[PDB]
Design a protein around this ligand. Structure first.
Ligand SMILES: Cc1csc(NC[C@@H]2CCCO2)n1
Ligand SMILES: [Zn+2]
Ligand SMILES: [Zn+2]
Ligand SMILES: [Zn+2]
Ligand SMILES: [Zn+2]
Lengths: 69, 77
């Protein structure tokens, strides 16, 4: 039904939001510290000196284990 | 259809996985450090001395800004 389509859309948007903002191919699993933006996969996060969202200096990258992984 | 119910179930399980494992009422937004388990809201994470998943001691809690977060602001109309 049209309801099935609406639910398909919500699921797709949630899935897209889980992907890395830099490569768009891998699941997010890293956090920039101390700002806390959690927007990249480990490979893309490892290469950044500053946060791609807020420009704060990245002191370190913390790997995150999320229940949605 | 039955597929509408299946999709409703998948969406419900994904939404439940985004809620705090301790209170079940607020979105996850905190990481236990150093273990890295990101399973609580800020209120439950502040009260735990050890991680509820792996029992590693919590040295500090890091707030996380996730692209999936929602608030009362996201309400339609
Ligand atoms: C709000 C929340 C709790 S767990 C989760 N998973 C979706 C994430 C966003 C970053 C990678 O997937 N979101
Ligand atoms: Zn990436
Ligand atoms: Zn940032
Ligand atoms: Zn909680
Ligand atoms: Zn842990």
């Amino acid at each position: 039904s049209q309801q099935t389509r609406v639910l398909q859309e919500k699921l797709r948007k949630l899935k897209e939001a889980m992907l890395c903002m830099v490569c768009c191919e891998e699941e997010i699993n890293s956090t920039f510290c101390p700002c806390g933006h959690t927007v990249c996969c480990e490979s893309c996060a490892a290469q950044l000196q500053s946060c791609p969202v807020c420009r704060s200096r990245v002191e370190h990258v913390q790997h995150v284990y999320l229940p949605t992984h």
